[PDB]
């Protein structure tokens, strides 16, 4: 089970925004992805966390930090820009032979002028 919150977040451009992705069960085989939805609701990978490391896909302003309780993660967008406005979610899978893709509900970011 994953939650992603606050369900909506509004910030001025330049702000370092945070969503929290919370997992019901963490284990070190899990790989956590932070995704953004396209206009047609397709998932698009922003960043990943696995083996203790945050790895952005193409924009290093997207950082994932695992909090000390190992179950909660801060999904941070540094130096937000208007173009970051949209819907995001987190997803997890294990490396196990029988693994289901699990996803959190979507959360909306609105980044406003100035």
């Amino acid at each position: 089970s994953l939650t992603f919150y606050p369900a909506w977040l509004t910030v001025s451009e330049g702000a370092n925004a945070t969503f929290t992705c919370s997992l019901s069960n963490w284990s070190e085989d899990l790989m956590l992805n932070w995704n953004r939805l396209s206009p047609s609701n397709q998932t698009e990978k922003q960043a990943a966390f696995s083996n203790g490391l945050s790895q952005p896909v193409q924009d290093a302003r997207f950082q994932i930090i695992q909090l000390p309780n190992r179950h909660d993660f801060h999904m941070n967008i540094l130096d937000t820009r208007r173009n970051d406005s949209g819907i995001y979610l987190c997803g997890a899978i294990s490396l196990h032979p029988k693994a289901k893709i699990e996803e959190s509900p979507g959360a909306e970011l609105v980044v406003t002028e100035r």
């Binding site: 609701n41 397709q42 790895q55 896909v57 899978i93």
Partner: protein, 191 residues
Amino acid sequence: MLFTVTAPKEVYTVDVGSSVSLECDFDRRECTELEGIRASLQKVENDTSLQSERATLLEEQLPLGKALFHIPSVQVRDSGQYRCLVICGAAWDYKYLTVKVKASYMRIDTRILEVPGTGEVQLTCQARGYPLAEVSWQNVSVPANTSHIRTPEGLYQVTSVLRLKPQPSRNFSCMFWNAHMKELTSAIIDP
């Protein structure tokens, strides 16, 4: 690693009884280790993403950065949302794909009957297909009665019944409009 998966096509429209090859491309330069690639397809049902047991991975396409999943003789129960998932080492990505299905209302069975007592004729058209068709009768002002059921295979059987006083030398044409697929089919009834 910077591993991503893309889906060149988001919606597949498939004829019932024909195959589909669902594709997702992946990044080979960030997954040079072709040995530890795991590509799979899941169908989403009851908000649960379980592996598909209908699809076969055409693994001969993997070296070319393409995960292709073949489903033979697609049925109505195969429609809906899927996820293609690729894992390479300690990274993964996925994409959603929609399968929409179609079955042409191509076989139209017809009937003509005289309605004892009334002097009227009863004309019937019946055809199976997918999604639900609407039926109209060309150049007839009397309304018909149209209904449907579902068949065991998930198709709609649509039946339209028109009852009227038969006009001299006049044929009656029933027209099935499969709106979601923009297809018109028709049959002529000669009384």
